[PDB]
Structures are given as C-alpha cells and as structure tokens.
C-alpha cells in the first residue's frame, strides 16, 4: 500500500484513523468555544421559535424548532453488508439532516442560525428590541424596513446559499448568493423566487467565496457569511450535540463505555461536521466517536489534519481537481481554524468516489425509500471502514462485547429538497 497522502493524490479511496485524539478535558482549551457558548444558541434559538413558527409555517407544529427525525436504517444496514462483505457490528441508525425544514440540508442549522444571530444584533444595537421580548413583533412591516436597508452575502455551492437566502430574504435583508461553478440550476431557481440576488461565476467554491467575501467589505451595511472562518455558524451547527442527545434519550437508547456511539460526517469545509461533533462531544463526552467523510476528489480536511498545515494546503496542492459529483463537499481548502480546534476530538478521516455514493443513494432508496443527494451518502461507507480496522479497535481498546453494542449513526447532510427530475438523475447513476 502507498503511504496515505500518495493514495490521496492517487484519488484511491482511504482512511486515516487520528493517533493523536484525547479525552474531552484534554482537547477542550483548544476549541476556543465552550458549552456555555453552545447553551447561548441554544438560548437565541428558542428565542426566535415563535418568529419562525409564523415565518416559516411548516414549523408551526414545532414551533418553530428546526429538528430531524433519527431513524433506524437495518435494512440498508443488510445490503452494505452484502454488498461490501464487510459485517457492521451493532445498530445502523440515520440522522436526516436531508429533511431539515426550511432549507433540506444541515445548513438549515448553521446558515439559518447565522442570518438570526444577525438580525438579532442588528435590532438588538438599534433599540428595537430586548432579549425578553417575542420575537414575533420582527414579522412587522416596520421591522422588515428596518432589515431591508441591510444586506448579506454569501459565497456556495450551494445548500448554504439555499439556507442564507431563503432565511435573509424572508427575515427583510436584501441577500446576494454568489453561487460556484456550476451549482445545480434547481438552487438557483429557488433562490430567485424567494427574492435573491445571484451571481454566477465559473469557478469553484473556494473562489466564489472570496469573490463574495470582496462584495461585502465594500459596504458597512453589508456582511458576508464567511463559512471559512465564522463560529457563529460552527456554533449553530453545534446545537445538534443537544438535540440528539434528548432524542437518543427518549428512544431508550444509551450511549455509554459499554455502548459506544460512532457517527460519521459528510465533510465540506468542515464548520457542519465540526461543529455537530462538537456539540456531540459536549453532550456525550469520550463515548462518542466521530469521523469525517470527504470525496476523493476533495480531501481538504484530511489533508489539513493529517500533514498538520490545515488551511494553508488545498487539495489543488497535490493535484486534485476539486471536481466532484457531491457539490456540498467540494470544497478545496480546509476551514480557518475548525482542524486545529477539533483534531483531538477527531477518530477519523475517510474519502469515498462518487460512484460508492452514487451506488449507497440508490441503495438506500430500494432498502428504506429515503432519497438523498450524493454528499449525504458520505458518511454511509464509515461504518464499514471502522468495523473492517482492528488496529483502529486495539488503538481504543475496544472488545468484541462493545462493538456488538455499537450504534454507527449516519449523517444525511442534504437531499430533501432536491426535485424528481434531479433525483432521478441520481438514482441513475448508481449500480
Ligand atoms: C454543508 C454540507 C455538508 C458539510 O459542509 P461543510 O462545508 O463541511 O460545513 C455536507 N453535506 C451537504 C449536503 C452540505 O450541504
Ligand atoms: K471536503
């Protein structure tokens, strides 16, 4: 076998398993964030309940709470086994990200949260509201006036987008997404009857966004959604740790040193399956386990984590194209500081092909009628990758008695709102 970083530049797929990870106290002071930070979104996301309960009906029956369903997935759990001859210990669960309301992706959690951590400061510094207040009053015209006189901008490619414009433009903000090459003319078409702006280049993500990041300086009233850099968005993300947490309690399902919890995240910059882990480690401590999940063709966390450079490598560095199928995670260049915040915290890092997505998103449709788009088919491979690895085992200590207690939970990051005519071209693309 080649050593790792030439299977990376050879696009074979691979995993790295973290030799460096420590307890939760061990990694904590590196994060630069704390649970209390974690209780603060929690806190402004309440707060913004009932706004988005009116805003965004299809919340009302929450209100307006932006939580997934975790299911059980045992007969996909079936065919990955048949189908990789590679048994998978314990319970295979899913976590449908894909079918967050609002936006259908896992930036319904982070976007979304940024663009109201937003508009509340904004109101809060102009004297127009209190932290005690219902946040149903910002529904107001005078409120909207007040927002639209503020804009936002955001580079994607684009489920972010998806999630900034939708949220901006119904909150009152004037939104512009500037969308990467060539990001799926469906996003664009929904962007555009919810009132945004967008702007189409040629290049990819790394480029749209710092094309977008320029547009912003220009203008005190303008901010730029920066998904390289903000904590606000990893912090959004982080609320999910709770979340599932209270889930996993009202199921009867226990996550402890004797029923360990591994979870596996579709990686893009790394702010969602950093943050989700983060938020999961709070919650869970040293019994949770987390690996991160990125395309062949874009191995950009990885890569940072593994050669210790983080963002000052790309993947374009070593010869790869960034040209993949998964348009969430194609993203060239590791986050700002989410690799050296969360490395010790980190089990793993794995790449997977399009074509193992596209084979696992058509699968996964005939096995438990969930249809997905391929970036939340990344993680599904993980469980496997663990499961076949004894030295991974023996660097942890786990016995054959844990294992069997296993729950592998997948993260589904996108999908449910992609149309029939484009999902149909996915499923035709898996074997
Ligand atoms: C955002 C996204 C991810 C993870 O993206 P990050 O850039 O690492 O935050 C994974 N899957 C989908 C479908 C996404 O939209
Ligand atoms: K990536």
Avoid at 46 to 68: D, M, N, Q, V
Avoid at 76 to 86: A, G, P, S, V
Avoid at 139 to 159: D, H, M, R
Wanted: glycine content about 10%.
């Amino acid at each position: 076998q080649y050593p790792l970083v030439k299977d990376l530049v050879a696009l074979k797929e691979t995993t790295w398993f973290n030799p460096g990870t420590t307890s939760l106290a061990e990694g904590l002071p590196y994060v630069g964030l704390t649970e209390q930070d974690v209780q603060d979104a929690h806190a402004r996301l309440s707060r913004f309940a009932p706004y988005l309960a009116k805003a965004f009906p299809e919340t009302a029956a929450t209100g307006g709470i932006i939580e997934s369903e975790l299911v059980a997935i045992p007969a996909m759990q079936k065919r990955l086994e048949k189908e990789y001859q590679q048994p998978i210990s314990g319970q295979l669960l899913l976590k449908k990200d894909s079918h967050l309301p609002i936006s259908g992706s896992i930036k319904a959690r982070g976007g979304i949260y940024e663009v109201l951590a937003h508009a509340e400061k904004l109101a809060l510094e102009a004297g127009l509201l209190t932290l005690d207040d219902d946040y149903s009053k910002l529904l107001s015209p005078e409120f909207k006036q007040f927002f639209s006189q503020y804009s936002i901008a955001v580079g994607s490619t684009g489920n972010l987008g998806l999630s900034i414009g939708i949220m901006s433009a119904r909150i009152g903000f004037k939104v512009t997404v500037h969308m990467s090459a060539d990001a799926r003319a469906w996003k664009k078409a929904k962007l555009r009857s919810h009132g945004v702006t967008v702007v189409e280049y040629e290049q990819d993500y790394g480029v749209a966004v710092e094309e977008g990041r320029k547009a912003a300086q220009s203008d005190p009233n303008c901010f730029f959604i920066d998904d390289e850099n903000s904590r606000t968005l990893f912090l959004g993300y982080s609320v999910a740790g709770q979340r599932l947490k209270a889930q996993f309690a009202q199921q009867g399902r226990i996550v402890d040193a004797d029923n360990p919890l591994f979870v596996y995240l579709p990686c893009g910059v790394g702010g969602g399956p950093g943050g989700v882990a983060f938020g999961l480690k709070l919650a869970f401590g040293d019994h949770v386990h987390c690996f991160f999940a990125e395309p062949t063709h874009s191995p950009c966390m990885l890569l940072g984590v593994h050669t210790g450079l983080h963002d000052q490598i790309s993947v374009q560095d070593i010869g790869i194209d960034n040209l993949t199928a998964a348009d969430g995670l194609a993203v060239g260049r590791a986050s700002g500081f989410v690799g050296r915040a969360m490395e010790r915290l980190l089990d793993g890092f794995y790449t997977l092909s399009d074509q193992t997505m596209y084979d696992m998103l058509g699968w996964l449709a005939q096995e438990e009628g969930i249809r997905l788009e391929p970036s939340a088919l990344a993680g599904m491979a993980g469980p496997q990758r663990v499961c076949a690895s004894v030295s991974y085992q023996q660097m942890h200590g786990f016995s054959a008695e844990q294992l069997r207690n296993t729950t592998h939970l997948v993260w589904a990051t996108g999908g449910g709102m992609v149309p029939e005519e484009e999902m149909n071209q996915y499923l035709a693309k898996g074997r």
